[PDB]
Amino acid sequence: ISELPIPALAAWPPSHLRWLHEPLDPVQDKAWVQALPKVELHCHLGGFATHGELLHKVRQEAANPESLPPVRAIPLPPGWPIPEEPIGLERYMRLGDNNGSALLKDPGCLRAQCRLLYEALLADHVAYAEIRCSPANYASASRSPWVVLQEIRNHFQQAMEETPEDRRCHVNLLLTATREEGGDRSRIARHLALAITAAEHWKNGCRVVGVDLAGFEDRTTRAAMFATDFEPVHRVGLAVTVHAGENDDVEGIWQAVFKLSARRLGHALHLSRSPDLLRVVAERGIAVELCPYANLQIKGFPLDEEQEGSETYPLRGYLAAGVAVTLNTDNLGISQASLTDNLLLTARLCPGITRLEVLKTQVFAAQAAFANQAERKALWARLAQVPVPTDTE
Amino acid sequence: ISELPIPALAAWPPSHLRWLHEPLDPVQDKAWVQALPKVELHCHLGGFATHGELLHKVRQEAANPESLPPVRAIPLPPGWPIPEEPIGLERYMRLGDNNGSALLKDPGCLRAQCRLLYEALLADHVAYAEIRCSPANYASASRSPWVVLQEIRNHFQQAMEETPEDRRCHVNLLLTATREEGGDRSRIARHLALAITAAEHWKNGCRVVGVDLAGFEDRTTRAAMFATDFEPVHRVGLAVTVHAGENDDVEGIWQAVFKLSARRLGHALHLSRSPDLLRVVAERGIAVELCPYANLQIKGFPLDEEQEGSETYPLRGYLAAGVAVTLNTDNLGISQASLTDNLLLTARLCPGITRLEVLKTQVFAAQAAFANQAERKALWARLAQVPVPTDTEQ
Amino acid sequence: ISELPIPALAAWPPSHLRWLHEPLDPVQDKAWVQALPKVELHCHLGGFATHGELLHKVRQEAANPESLPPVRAIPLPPGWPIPEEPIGLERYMRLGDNNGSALLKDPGCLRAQCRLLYEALLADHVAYAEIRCSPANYASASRSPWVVLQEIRNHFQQAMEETPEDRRCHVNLLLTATREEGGDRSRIARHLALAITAAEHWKNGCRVVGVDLAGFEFATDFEPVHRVGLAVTVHAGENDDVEGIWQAVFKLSARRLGHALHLSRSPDLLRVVAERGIAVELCPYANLQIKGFPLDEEQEGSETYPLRGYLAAGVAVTLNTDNLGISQASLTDNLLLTARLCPGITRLEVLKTQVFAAQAAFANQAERKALWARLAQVPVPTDTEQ
Amino acid sequence: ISELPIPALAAWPPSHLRWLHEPLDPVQDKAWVQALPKVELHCHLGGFATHGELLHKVRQEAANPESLPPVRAIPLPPGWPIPEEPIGLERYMRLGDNNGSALLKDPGCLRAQCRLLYEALLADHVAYAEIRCSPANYASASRSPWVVLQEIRNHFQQAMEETPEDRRCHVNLLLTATREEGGDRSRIARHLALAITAAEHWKNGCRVVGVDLAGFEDRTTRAAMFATDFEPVHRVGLAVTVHAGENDDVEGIWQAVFKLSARRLGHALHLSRSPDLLRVVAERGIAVELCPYANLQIKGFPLDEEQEGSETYPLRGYLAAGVAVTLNTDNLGISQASLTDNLLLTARLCPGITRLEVLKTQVFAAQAAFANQAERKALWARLAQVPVPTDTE
Amino acid sequence: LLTATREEGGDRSRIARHLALAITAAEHWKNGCRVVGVDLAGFEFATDFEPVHRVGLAVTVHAGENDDVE
Amino acid sequence: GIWQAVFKLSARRLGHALHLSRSPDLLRVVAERGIAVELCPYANLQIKGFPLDEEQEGSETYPLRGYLAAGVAVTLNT
Ligand SMILES: Nc1ncnc2c1ncn2[C@@H]1O[C@H](COP(=O)(O)OP(=O)(O)OP(=O)(O)O)[C@@H](O)[C@H]1O
Ligand SMILES: Nc1ncnc2c1ncn2[C@@H]1O[C@H](COP(=O)(O)OP(=O)(O)OP(=O)(O)O)[C@@H](O)[C@H]1O
Ligand SMILES: Nc1ncnc2c1ncn2[C@@H]1O[C@H](COP(=O)(O)OP(=O)(O)OP(=O)(O)O)[C@@H](O)[C@H]1O
Ligand SMILES: Nc1ncnc2c1ncn2[C@@H]1O[C@H](COP(=O)(O)OP(=O)(O)OP(=O)(O)O)[C@@H](O)[C@H]1O
Ligand SMILES: [Mg+2]
Ligand SMILES: [Mg+2]
Ligand SMILES: [Zn+2]
Ligand SMILES: [Zn+2]
Ligand SMILES: [Zn+2]
């Protein structure tokens, strides 16, 4: 019974302790997954309402109506949400363009984004979430990057107060730095000053808990990421999370762990190919952020297989290796899946996956989260509220 | 019309122009200096209402008039503000313990501090001021350093908008990297991060224009500050001023100019010892900001000497070497002297200083201010209104 | 129920769960701490038997009996498990000069030293131990530091195979690279290169798991160490700078801090050290004898022992013995004197220090599964009658 | 009379002041500009007698006439000095091949290049000149770079002492480190060491006032410059000037102002592209030295336009932004025109340029010059004799 | 040989002036008496002597007043 | 590269230093400090290629004799 992830999970009927050790079914477990207290660690604010009804619930709430960019017709590929072929990384980002930097440069639209994203998290029974936003991308002449960030924190804090304590998703903000750094260096340290300042203005509720180092994928940005002083952010308590991904550079992942002191690696899909890096990423406690739907639509993986293979999703191999893996959503709108759908899609990507393994990902996520001693004492008290199975056999 | 700093002093009557070249009279010219549109560059906000009737008025404005610390009795040296013998900076910095860290943590006391200070700036006819504040010292559990800073800016911004354009003193903010109390890399990283964010939150009115690198005296405070990357400060447009008082350390001034890229030197009273450093300061146009009363009280100088001596005030020596010298007040309350008084003391401190030297120091200050093109155009328009003399009869 | 660190403490009768939350008895619980499966993370090989009778046993079975330097004179301070006053560190080092570099720079003696130390670990019911050695300190003109290290590993490896698997104490080596503030810097280079080479040589049984740092309390010297999967632990004893623990965590990439008794001074270091999982190695007897702490106080003051404060803050605190012979106290004794130093320490906290050590050990996946299973069999209480 | 650059312009009658604010006429103002006390801050010694009669005058005074290189065929592009199309830097550099480090290696020819150049400076009524030379390029087996530098300084000093004080141009020397790509980084060390030695040797008359980083237009010598430790040249009182490379890079300029402590920038024609860099350059007081003819022939700009544009000469944009802009001649021989000719071209390159703008540029040059307190007090006394207009209406 | 002596927090201009003088004199004279190297009476500064090595000047370290192999 | 090897790697031998004569200062430093230049004739010919069976010393000729005449310690290897 010691193999169980949660201490409260041991004191169950013996039948359920055998059900949890049985492979998860992606069709009949939609109700059990839909009630699990979940943790979200890789969520982008810009890619939430990128098309559909949500894209018009935000545009109808704009402060000024006549300034919104006209809705362009971005054709979602066929087979979507599950494309028959990968669409690449560049096409994946371009899919969500009716939101982000063009729709949320408005007090009204940005408030519909924060408020609509919180209800979606509550609809998925998420107990903790680190939302990744770029305030510097949304700043107009009158709206400073601090004004934008100060409103995002206040909108989420307002949502967290109107809900009861037991149905309350605790939202924390990660500040991402990407895109513009390829043409300047002032922005890389202009964005690290917000985090240091934002990490001190607020001490309770919604807080800026870390700095998200997007742009670690490119090579010139990586030149400026190690050409920047990161000790000031380390002293102030901010944690560092990095985007790995298409660039399959083992040397890049090595520098982040030991030069930037990164505590989480995003989209580390090619980590098993280096056996020496896997151990270091497994003994030091580094948490890997995996996104099932967002990786199938950008890289492609075999679905509905029978036995493990050479191009299988690395979720199973990481768990055996001891790596602390976590399943996330990446882009709730640019993709079409909630945190429940992603957890269910890891039964057609990873053959033989156990239901208890789905619970371990929410225990690893509950330890990788950049929360304090108070936030992480109410998160574990909510993961112990896992619902009893509906079938049991 | 050969060597005239202000260009409005060219259609100047020859009788008055010759009067401009005569030595300044400390007692008679008090009325003329009082009407001069001056520039302030070294003014510590927390040393304004240190004692006297001004200290009390900051204390009935307290939002919570029960947590106010008691009034500690801090006697002044006899003969203040002109002490018989210099008291040193350690004793000097303790005279203003009734205001500062204790007090100014109440939101009401800070608002009175900012508004009362602005009133004293209009009384001296100051056209541009750069107040040095440390928001990290007035912060509490419910008041972060950013909240304190945003309150200080909005108190000065309101006062600016309530004044006519022709009689308005434009106030800017400098963030001070504190003395030996500072030096921790977790504290100098917070001070610079706040300055970078505040340098961009505001683009009109009262603004944050630079960081004051106090504690340069401490040898342990150095090399924690040379170990921090000041490049992001320079990229965002923040100017660096170094508070180089209370020693002759020639190898520290050399590194501030060329490593920290500092643009102003505070209390550089030993520049004449190193002629090589004096040429670099004069040629590169680094402004040396001198504080007459604060220097006389802290370290002492001869007064009313007939001829220039070895220990004489270096104000005229700096001017002869083409150094952009500026005269400031340092601490309005602790020193117990206004900007007008500081200019008049130069006659006693520096023998034979002409009335054109005083006007030159104000032109030097206008060039050394951390002001953008919009504020410079307004400051230059105010410096062209030189008051007409009254005693041009000898 | 979701507060015990092992999913086996929960499924007990109600009274046992109630006896754990009571303060640990430093007398009655002697028979129960002795039966606990402990984990040792701060043990020095050069201080096992520095005087007494075990000095003779190591001295008896040398291989060059005409070389053994004569026994010097070591006055133990008054009583000494527990000194009346601190003796300092530099004095504390010289309390064990009858054993170490001199005696162990002889093939026969070094066999006894590793053979006897493993004997002590078994008697204490230790399921895991990371021993610290300095092979370059035992080298001669015909016994290179590699030869010394290879002998040490096989002596521990031989003992492990001679003991049954149920009672086996898995031992791993931890090379100590000490910063000579006056001495030559080559021995820093030799030790690091020796650990980088030993990392790949052995993959089963006794292994060289990491490098220890007695000094710098060196950033560029440790980049190669991190490539080969070696974990660095930094001594943080004498001196009281925060900037040393601040550059050990983020420049040397340290994963364990030894004798860090002044973390509470800084309020940001405690959060960082308690949010990244950095473990603090504490030695009750060694810290008491070196620096001195109030004992038997009925309340927690300003100078009290920081174990309970660290535990409240979430810092992963382990309890160790540092030097066995020099301190003259076993792991159970160190685990019992903590009650005297820390008033109100519950007996579940003592169980907490062992779980934290299990997560702090430099063992691999296979090593951890044997260590975790062995910790599952927690001994049932004996004196539960009140 | 509150923004007049020169204090002596306030005493003018209030009828010429109206003329002073009118746009510069490049045809009717030839006589007025020719009598203006001018300042030359960018003038290469090796590109003066590159062709024409001046080349043969220099070639005729050689001490070793048998060693004179043959006069090669250098065809100037058609339409010179106003090329029909830009000819580029590399082609522009090769126009001055009949003069340079071929004739100047002869001690006799060096006198002609140094004494004829001074005679061309008095024709333009220049009150202060900063000639930049590379003594290491004219060295021989029996003539070290220090020997060449002594002759250059003493040839200009002799001419300076044979001219009246109210008619004498004060010539100062700048040493150029011309970026040998990798093969010779000892040339940079040799160049900087020569400047430091000469910075203390002479304290009166002609002096070595600074070092010219003409090699900043590269990528490996820019890296060589950025690791050269310019600290010693800063302690001996030497100023630093940097050639803003033809490559449109902003990261180089940011390091020239804050890492090399440069006090001037040469051909900084792309400062407006970064609005944050133009603000720092305008506030710190860095002087941008612009050559109209050298820029119109190398890069090419629209001429005689009736209004501004997206490709117009950046003189007006820099002046409006509060930047210290100076007009120079660069290579006075290769460009085939004088300082007076360059000033009148701004009426064609920059439409609407006023006659008070050219006066401002001379005031900017007088403040950007690397002169001491003695040479500056004599330069201002010469700039106060502004010639009275000959038209007035 | 030109001696570039580090001072106890004294002057730093002479350590650079002597190095520049040595670099110039190494190329100035090629017969008879010559400047053949620089003497370092301090640091016993690694970024201050790259120009010395790039020109072929030999350096001799003038150790003293200490017993340190470092 | 030959500069950083000598003065930053503290090299005592240089392998395949066929372009030493391009920098007279570097050649003089190598000769004076006694740094040995190890040359491989067949490997250099097969990789770089040099004229063969000439009668005089050309610009592209193999740099052995030039290095020996300059006082450099040259070694021939396989
Ligand atoms: N897979 C990825 N790889 C690299 N960068 C990514 C990736 N996914 C998101 N980003 C970065 O995340 C940043 C934040 O995206 P977000 O969804 O919050 O909207 P946004 O900033 O408005 O987007 P955009 O930059 O596309 O207009 C974007 O700048 C994008 O550069
Ligand atoms: N060297 C200095 N460093 C920092 N602040 C200074 C200094 N000299 C004067 N001050 C004033 O101190 C203010 C912040 O510090 P604080 O008000 O606590 O003063 P203090 O000198 O530390 O002591 P006190 O509060 O007793 O006056 C600054 O805004 C400035 O007004
Ligand atoms: N508790 C400690 N604190 C600091 N340094 C220590 C400590 N214990 C040992 N060292 C250092 O580690 C080395 C000794 O390690 P070890 O105890 O394994 O061998 P030893 O037999 O005691 O050696 P030696 O006789 O050379 O001291 C020496 O550098 C000693 O300074
Ligand atoms: N416009 C320019 N941009 C960049 N570098 C330049 C420019 N003009 C000249 N230089 C550099 O200045 C160096 C010295 O120029 P100068 O005219 O004084 O010498 P020179 O005798 O003409 O030299 P050379 O024969 O090598 O061209 C030239 O070698 C060239 O490297
Ligand atoms: Mg010992
Ligand atoms: Mg030429
Ligand atoms: Zn992300
Ligand atoms: Zn001050
Ligand atoms: Zn040039």
JSON list of N, CA, C and O and ligand atoms in Angstrom, two decimals, chain D residues 42 44 132 212 214 243 267 330-331, ligand 9:
[
{"chain": "D", "resi": 42, "resn": "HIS", "atom": "N", "xyz": [35.97, 65.51, -37.77]},
{"chain": "D", "resi": 42, "resn": "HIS", "atom": "CA", "xyz": [36.13, 64.26, -38.52]},
{"chain": "D", "resi": 42, "resn": "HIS", "atom": "C", "xyz": [36.88, 64.60, -39.81]},
{"chain": "D", "resi": 42, "resn": "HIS", "atom": "O", "xyz": [36.30, 65.15, -40.75]},
{"chain": "D", "resi": 44, "resn": "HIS", "atom": "N", "xyz": [40.29, 62.78, -41.97]},
{"chain": "D", "resi": 44, "resn": "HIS", "atom": "CA", "xyz": [41.39, 61.84, -42.07]},
{"chain": "D", "resi": 44, "resn": "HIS", "atom": "C", "xyz": [42.57, 62.47, -42.80]},
{"chain": "D", "resi": 44, "resn": "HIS", "atom": "O", "xyz": [42.39, 63.16, -43.81]},
{"chain": "D", "resi": 132, "resn": "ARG", "atom": "N", "xyz": [42.60, 63.00, -37.60]},
{"chain": "D", "resi": 132, "resn": "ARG", "atom": "CA", "xyz": [42.82, 61.62, -37.18]},
{"chain": "D", "resi": 132, "resn": "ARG", "atom": "C", "xyz": [43.79, 60.95, -38.13]},
{"chain": "D", "resi": 132, "resn": "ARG", "atom": "O", "xyz": [43.61, 61.02, -39.36]},
{"chain": "D", "resi": 212, "resn": "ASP", "atom": "N", "xyz": [40.71, 57.18, -31.91]},
{"chain": "D", "resi": 212, "resn": "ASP", "atom": "CA", "xyz": [39.59, 56.94, -32.81]},
{"chain": "D", "resi": 212, "resn": "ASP", "atom": "C", "xyz": [39.41, 55.44, -33.00]},
{"chain": "D", "resi": 212, "resn": "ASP", "atom": "O", "xyz": [40.30, 54.77, -33.53]},
{"chain": "D", "resi": 214, "resn": "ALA", "atom": "N", "xyz": [38.05, 53.65, -35.23]},
{"chain": "D", "resi": 214, "resn": "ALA", "atom": "CA", "xyz": [37.59, 53.47, -36.60]},
{"chain": "D", "resi": 214, "resn": "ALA", "atom": "C", "xyz": [37.29, 52.01, -36.92]},
{"chain": "D", "resi": 214, "resn": "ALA", "atom": "O", "xyz": [36.62, 51.74, -37.92]},
{"chain": "D", "resi": 243, "resn": "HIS", "atom": "N", "xyz": [33.42, 54.84, -34.62]},
{"chain": "D", "resi": 243, "resn": "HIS", "atom": "CA", "xyz": [32.82, 54.85, -35.96]},
{"chain": "D", "resi": 243, "resn": "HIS", "atom": "C", "xyz": [31.57, 53.97, -35.92]},
{"chain": "D", "resi": 243, "resn": "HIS", "atom": "O", "xyz": [31.67, 52.75, -35.87]},
{"chain": "D", "resi": 267, "resn": "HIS", "atom": "N", "xyz": [28.88, 58.82, -38.06]},
{"chain": "D", "resi": 267, "resn": "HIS", "atom": "CA", "xyz": [27.92, 58.31, -39.03]},
{"chain": "D", "resi": 267, "resn": "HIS", "atom": "C", "xyz": [26.84, 57.46, -38.36]},
{"chain": "D", "resi": 267, "resn": "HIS", "atom": "O", "xyz": [26.50, 56.36, -38.81]},
{"chain": "D", "resi": 330, "resn": "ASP", "atom": "N", "xyz": [34.83, 64.27, -43.34]},
{"chain": "D", "resi": 330, "resn": "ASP", "atom": "CA", "xyz": [35.39, 62.93, -43.48]},
{"chain": "D", "resi": 330, "resn": "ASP", "atom": "C", "xyz": [36.72, 62.99, -44.23]},
{"chain": "D", "resi": 330, "resn": "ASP", "atom": "O", "xyz": [37.66, 63.64, -43.77]},
{"chain": "D", "resi": 331, "resn": "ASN", "atom": "N", "xyz": [36.80, 62.33, -45.38]},
{"chain": "D", "resi": 331, "resn": "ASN", "atom": "CA", "xyz": [37.98, 62.41, -46.24]},
{"chain": "D", "resi": 331, "resn": "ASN", "atom": "C", "xyz": [37.81, 63.61, -47.16]},
{"chain": "D", "resi": 331, "resn": "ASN", "atom": "O", "xyz": [36.99, 63.58, -48.09]},
{"chain": "G", "resi": 9, "resn": "ZN", "atom": "ZN", "xyz": [36.18, 58.04, -40.27]}
]
